[PDB]
């Protein structure tokens, strides 16, 4: 009945003059601190998104707790007349450049509208920072350099939401998970499909990798041991959809539904996935958070995959939170206070009226594996 006894559970965002949704969590291994991003809307309704907020949490080792600083708006992260949403932070380990990818949309134009009209008006933006988010650069509209030709082919699109991924490939590449509503039938409605924007020049230029099976929405990616990228996407189907890539994000194959990982009725809900050092045959294991209830968005659960990316390998969940739970984001924080893998979790709680930070170790969530 009781939720999982964690290392830490604290409300990091709450409604007030504004409502806060769509959480993102970035871990700076060298700072030993987290960057918590969220959307600051004038109300819970999507069409009311405005700016992106940020909070820095620095991990204290003596007490194994994370102390967060006052929330601030990533001012530079926005385009004139458009509202910003869907944050997708990434940290380029080598250039030390911190990236924040977001989507800018004109006025309060809805997503439904770009859909019904098959008219895309969504801009792809990013802002960078070299002092860990203290001062951001001026907004840079990537739409043309990242899209262009494929712009008319989509009714709309979006990045993440959630932390992006830098590969440990022969060139440490940037992979930004995303999904788009593609126009494939003159009569039938557009079908969304997950995919990743790739950058091999450290952000200089981009490229869109090929789509995966269709009817997949917001997804996230991870890398595992010969070196592959498993993707996990939100589907309007019974459960979650997941595919793997063996060419650094350019192609996703073996895509299939995973019934062990349920999805709420309508169009499902966003979820998060990360990889981490196996406590002992495979180099990495995966951890994934998503609501475990099947009629609604409640009971946030954590799932383990000790033999990735074998779909049947996925484990049964463990209750991280009882009640209303929605969008979440995960981060591997290294080795915890108890010698096991440390995890940082950010999730939408209490009917979108607060976003919570959760911190726990593998030994806590899945002690069985010991
Ligand atoms: C850009 C945008 O409106 N994103 C919205 C997203 C989207 O509608 C869905 O992924 C299919 O397009 O859904 C949800 C949601 O709580 O289910 C909130 C997001 O704000």
XYZ file of C-alpha atoms and ligand atoms in Angstrom:
390
model
C 0.000 0.000 0.000
C 2.704 2.485 0.954
C 4.779 4.105 -1.760
C 8.486 3.305 -2.031
C 10.634 4.637 0.839
C 13.074 6.803 -1.104
C 16.138 8.906 -0.353
C 14.198 12.076 -0.988
C 10.756 13.363 -2.017
C 10.246 17.119 -2.309
C 7.818 19.434 -4.146
C 10.011 21.503 -6.467
C 7.313 23.383 -8.387
C 3.807 24.321 -7.320
C 0.972 26.237 -8.836
C 0.530 29.841 -7.768
C 0.458 32.875 -10.024
C 1.143 30.164 -12.641
C 0.702 26.438 -13.250
C 3.811 24.296 -13.884
C 3.963 21.327 -16.282
C 6.218 19.289 -18.580
C 9.276 18.555 -16.348
C 12.864 17.942 -17.503
C 15.850 16.838 -15.420
C 19.507 17.244 -16.349
C 22.447 15.848 -14.406
C 25.849 17.525 -14.519
C 28.185 14.730 -13.329
C 31.094 17.102 -12.791
C 29.002 19.541 -10.747
C 27.314 16.740 -8.902
C 24.121 18.737 -9.309
C 20.807 18.651 -11.164
C 19.004 21.106 -13.446
C 15.226 20.947 -13.161
C 13.271 22.484 -16.045
C 9.511 23.041 -16.332
C 6.853 24.974 -18.254
C 5.319 28.049 -16.648
C 1.794 28.294 -18.058
C -0.854 30.891 -17.251
C -3.083 27.891 -16.519
C -3.022 24.120 -16.748
C -4.280 24.218 -20.345
C -1.570 23.655 -22.960
C -2.631 26.615 -25.092
C -1.588 28.676 -22.064
C 2.124 27.874 -21.997
C 4.412 30.907 -21.836
C 7.951 30.542 -20.543
C 10.274 27.887 -19.211
C 11.410 27.916 -15.595
C 14.570 26.393 -14.128
C 15.899 25.408 -10.712
C 19.356 24.221 -9.822
C 19.680 21.454 -7.293
C 23.093 20.709 -5.891
C 23.628 17.253 -4.374
C 25.068 17.285 -0.825
C 27.117 14.146 -0.116
C 27.348 14.417 3.664
C 23.540 14.196 4.056
C 22.800 12.576 0.675
C 20.150 15.180 -0.097
C 19.665 17.718 -2.901
C 19.190 21.404 -2.032
C 17.415 23.424 -4.732
C 17.759 27.107 -5.383
C 15.058 29.638 -6.187
C 13.292 29.083 -9.501
C 14.151 31.401 -12.392
C 12.886 31.888 -15.923
C 15.222 30.992 -18.782
C 14.395 34.407 -20.229
C 16.395 33.940 -23.413
C 14.453 30.744 -24.124
C 11.614 32.211 -26.196
C 10.723 33.755 -29.563
C 8.865 37.034 -29.866
C 5.114 36.476 -29.951
C 5.421 32.697 -29.420
C 4.994 30.734 -26.222
C 7.763 28.330 -25.258
C 7.187 24.695 -24.330
C 8.691 21.332 -24.183
C 12.104 21.744 -22.729
C 14.844 19.378 -23.882
C 18.117 20.001 -22.047
C 21.336 18.314 -23.006
C 24.891 18.727 -21.820
C 27.808 18.340 -24.222
C 30.407 16.724 -21.952
C 33.267 17.750 -24.253
C 32.458 21.337 -25.229
C 30.978 21.943 -21.797
C 28.110 23.647 -23.606
C 24.687 23.241 -22.021
C 21.783 22.952 -24.438
C 18.110 23.679 -23.943
C 15.863 22.708 -26.810
C 12.286 23.896 -26.790
C 9.351 24.424 -29.080
C 7.992 27.931 -29.757
C 4.374 28.294 -30.901
C 2.619 31.522 -32.054
C 0.024 33.079 -29.805
C -2.277 30.588 -28.163
C -2.672 28.711 -31.422
C -3.426 25.164 -30.311
C -1.845 21.917 -31.503
C -5.294 20.771 -32.521
C -5.423 23.704 -34.901
C -2.139 22.937 -36.677
C -3.569 19.439 -36.937
C -7.105 20.014 -38.247
C -5.663 22.446 -40.779
C -2.611 20.299 -41.514
C -0.795 23.623 -41.120
C 2.468 23.571 -39.163
C 3.488 26.814 -37.456
C 5.785 25.368 -34.794
C 9.381 26.648 -34.538
C 12.330 24.573 -33.311
C 14.497 26.481 -30.890
C 17.489 26.022 -28.653
C 19.438 28.239 -26.289
C 22.909 27.522 -24.932
C 24.943 28.310 -21.853
C 28.546 27.785 -20.824
C 28.228 28.692 -17.149
C 25.847 25.872 -16.212
C 22.710 27.878 -16.890
C 23.685 31.109 -15.143
C 23.394 33.104 -18.351
C 21.879 31.737 -21.557
C 22.674 32.737 -25.104
C 20.219 34.431 -27.424
C 17.520 32.080 -28.821
C 18.519 30.277 -32.013
C 15.767 29.087 -34.370
C 16.847 25.697 -35.743
C 13.685 25.042 -37.766
C 15.307 25.642 -41.164
C 18.671 24.027 -40.413
C 16.964 21.077 -38.768
C 13.896 20.996 -40.880
C 13.091 22.993 -43.954
C 12.191 20.303 -46.574
C 10.254 18.233 -44.059
C 8.434 21.244 -42.663
C 5.425 21.094 -45.012
C 5.367 17.328 -44.625
C 4.295 17.731 -41.008
C 1.178 19.306 -39.510
C 3.144 19.897 -36.302
C 5.929 18.370 -34.179
C 7.789 18.572 -30.846
C 11.036 17.669 -29.066
C 11.130 15.388 -26.053
C 10.021 16.533 -23.622
C 12.809 15.520 -21.267
C 16.581 15.215 -21.156
C 18.262 14.574 -24.518
C 21.226 12.292 -25.131
C 24.873 12.618 -26.104
C 26.360 9.442 -27.583
C 29.682 7.868 -26.708
C 30.240 7.190 -30.379
C 33.471 7.831 -32.250
C 32.404 11.514 -32.228
C 30.251 12.082 -29.119
C 27.054 13.026 -30.967
C 23.918 14.831 -29.891
C 20.637 12.976 -30.159
C 17.426 14.881 -29.488
C 14.395 12.556 -29.315
C 11.219 13.945 -30.916
C 8.043 13.006 -32.794
C 6.073 14.473 -35.695
C 2.579 14.423 -37.194
C 3.229 13.384 -40.784
C 0.901 13.899 -43.737
C 0.645 10.506 -45.441
C -2.968 10.345 -46.667
C -4.933 13.099 -48.489
C -8.038 12.127 -46.531
C -6.986 10.178 -43.436
C -5.713 12.110 -40.401
C -1.974 12.671 -39.851
C -0.165 9.944 -37.906
C 2.563 10.964 -35.427
C 5.866 9.090 -35.322
C 8.946 9.276 -33.128
C 12.417 10.080 -34.454
C 15.666 11.860 -33.528
C 17.505 14.958 -34.695
C 21.214 14.188 -34.887
C 24.214 16.484 -34.671
C 27.788 15.293 -35.178
C 29.457 18.715 -35.117
C 28.569 19.384 -31.488
C 25.505 21.376 -32.441
C 26.941 23.188 -35.453
C 24.486 21.479 -37.830
C 21.702 18.907 -37.634
C 19.881 16.101 -39.395
C 16.616 14.201 -38.952
C 16.944 10.468 -38.507
C 14.358 8.139 -40.030
C 11.000 7.630 -38.339
C 10.065 4.490 -36.428
C 6.741 2.647 -36.638
C 3.922 5.154 -36.896
C 1.438 6.186 -34.245
C 4.099 6.952 -31.671
C 4.375 10.253 -29.829
C 6.732 11.750 -27.256
C 9.682 9.427 -26.763
C 13.069 9.333 -25.092
C 16.326 7.558 -25.812
C 19.166 5.795 -24.043
C 22.344 4.017 -25.120
C 23.477 0.499 -24.057
C 26.157 -2.167 -24.724
C 27.539 -3.665 -29.775
C 26.469 -0.156 -28.804
C 22.756 0.501 -29.390
C 20.106 3.118 -28.673
C 16.805 1.911 -27.295
C 13.891 4.275 -27.759
C 10.719 4.299 -25.648
C 7.658 6.041 -27.029
C 4.204 6.985 -25.862
C 1.531 5.264 -27.954
C -2.222 5.521 -28.142
C -2.229 1.756 -28.024
C -2.587 -0.688 -25.255
C 0.956 -0.054 -24.050
C 4.307 1.597 -24.710
C 6.175 1.212 -27.991
C 9.907 0.595 -28.149
C 12.515 0.283 -30.888
C 16.292 -0.003 -31.080
C 18.886 1.604 -33.340
C 22.266 0.254 -34.326
C 23.409 3.266 -36.353
C 23.414 6.001 -33.665
C 19.775 7.099 -33.950
C 19.485 7.239 -37.728
C 17.352 4.097 -37.869
C 15.041 2.411 -35.378
C 14.146 -1.254 -35.867
C 12.379 -4.152 -34.161
C 9.811 -1.605 -32.942
C 7.071 -3.303 -30.950
C 4.475 -2.791 -28.244
C 5.409 -3.794 -24.705
C 2.361 -4.912 -22.755
C 4.271 -5.055 -19.467
C 4.411 -1.257 -19.711
C 0.776 -0.087 -19.648
C -0.657 3.236 -20.924
C -3.709 5.286 -19.896
C -6.836 4.900 -22.142
C -7.020 7.947 -24.470
C -3.605 8.697 -25.981
C -1.366 7.476 -23.205
C 1.107 9.544 -21.249
C 4.751 10.576 -21.458
C 7.279 8.457 -19.570
C 11.053 8.421 -19.065
C 13.924 5.986 -19.709
C 17.605 5.942 -18.806
C 20.477 3.489 -18.737
C 23.029 2.911 -15.998
C 26.003 0.668 -15.073
C 24.829 -2.887 -14.374
C 25.568 -3.811 -10.730
C 27.467 -6.791 -12.136
C 27.061 -9.711 -17.847
C 25.531 -6.593 -19.506
C 27.301 -3.215 -19.255
C 24.060 -1.309 -18.721
C 20.535 -1.816 -17.456
C 17.553 0.455 -18.020
C 15.151 2.149 -15.657
C 11.864 3.618 -16.788
C 9.159 5.615 -14.978
C 5.561 6.035 -16.085
C 2.157 5.816 -14.384
C 1.139 2.259 -13.606
C -2.636 2.834 -13.446
C -4.430 1.832 -16.658
C -7.622 3.867 -16.609
C -5.976 7.118 -15.565
C -2.706 8.934 -14.842
C -1.794 7.699 -11.369
C 0.589 5.518 -9.368
C 3.978 6.410 -10.762
C 5.991 3.249 -11.066
C 9.593 2.367 -11.834
C 10.535 -0.516 -14.149
C 13.890 -2.323 -14.520
C 15.381 -4.073 -17.567
C 18.436 -6.140 -16.438
C 18.935 -7.604 -19.919
C 18.361 -4.679 -22.313
C 16.847 -4.276 -24.663
C 14.949 -7.594 -24.559
C 11.281 -6.484 -24.233
C 10.294 -9.516 -22.169
C 13.167 -8.690 -19.814
C 11.306 -5.617 -18.566
C 10.313 -6.098 -14.942
C 7.226 -5.465 -12.892
C 7.064 -1.951 -11.399
C 7.506 -0.586 -7.885
C 5.250 2.222 -6.615
C 7.193 5.475 -6.501
C 4.073 7.509 -5.849
C 0.405 6.872 -5.081
C -2.289 8.897 -6.781
C -2.239 11.461 -9.563
C 1.024 11.118 -11.520
C 1.776 12.166 -15.057
C 4.755 13.296 -17.115
C 8.089 12.330 -15.521
C 11.809 12.497 -16.321
C 14.740 10.406 -15.100
C 18.450 10.931 -14.521
C 21.288 8.613 -13.561
C 23.192 10.309 -10.750
C 26.032 7.859 -10.353
C 26.695 5.832 -7.226
C 24.376 6.424 -4.286
C 25.093 6.530 -0.528
C 24.522 2.780 -0.310
C 26.896 1.802 -3.083
C 24.083 1.197 -5.594
C 23.036 3.249 -8.664
C 21.522 6.614 -7.712
C 18.459 7.963 -9.522
C 16.833 11.376 -9.726
C 13.192 11.536 -10.738
C 11.033 14.521 -11.658
C 7.262 13.947 -12.035
C 3.928 15.788 -12.338
C 1.837 15.199 -9.235
C -1.508 16.154 -7.685
C -3.449 16.837 -10.854
C -0.737 19.006 -12.401
C -0.720 21.313 -9.392
C 2.865 20.479 -8.429
C 5.970 18.762 -9.806
C 7.939 16.518 -7.472
C 11.585 15.537 -7.204
C 12.312 11.977 -6.120
C 15.722 10.499 -5.277
C 16.487 6.834 -4.666
C 19.015 4.017 -5.223
C 18.727 0.703 -7.075
C 19.164 -1.179 -3.815
C 15.986 0.597 -2.687
C 13.709 0.139 -5.703
C 14.773 -3.404 -6.622
C 16.483 -4.858 -3.529
C 15.447 -8.265 -4.870
C 18.295 -8.066 -7.371
C 20.581 -8.502 -4.362
C 2.967 20.676 -27.744
C 1.896 20.046 -26.893
O 0.635 20.589 -26.940
N 2.201 18.993 -26.132
C 1.258 18.284 -25.256
C 1.210 16.762 -25.513
C 0.704 16.411 -26.937
O -0.630 16.900 -27.117
C 0.654 14.898 -27.224
O 1.958 14.337 -27.090
C 0.136 14.551 -28.635
O 0.370 15.548 -29.601
O 0.291 16.161 -24.567
C 0.269 16.528 -23.319
C -0.343 15.613 -22.411
O -0.441 15.915 -21.154
O -0.840 14.402 -22.822
C 0.827 17.818 -22.799
C 1.734 18.508 -23.835
O 1.772 19.907 -23.525
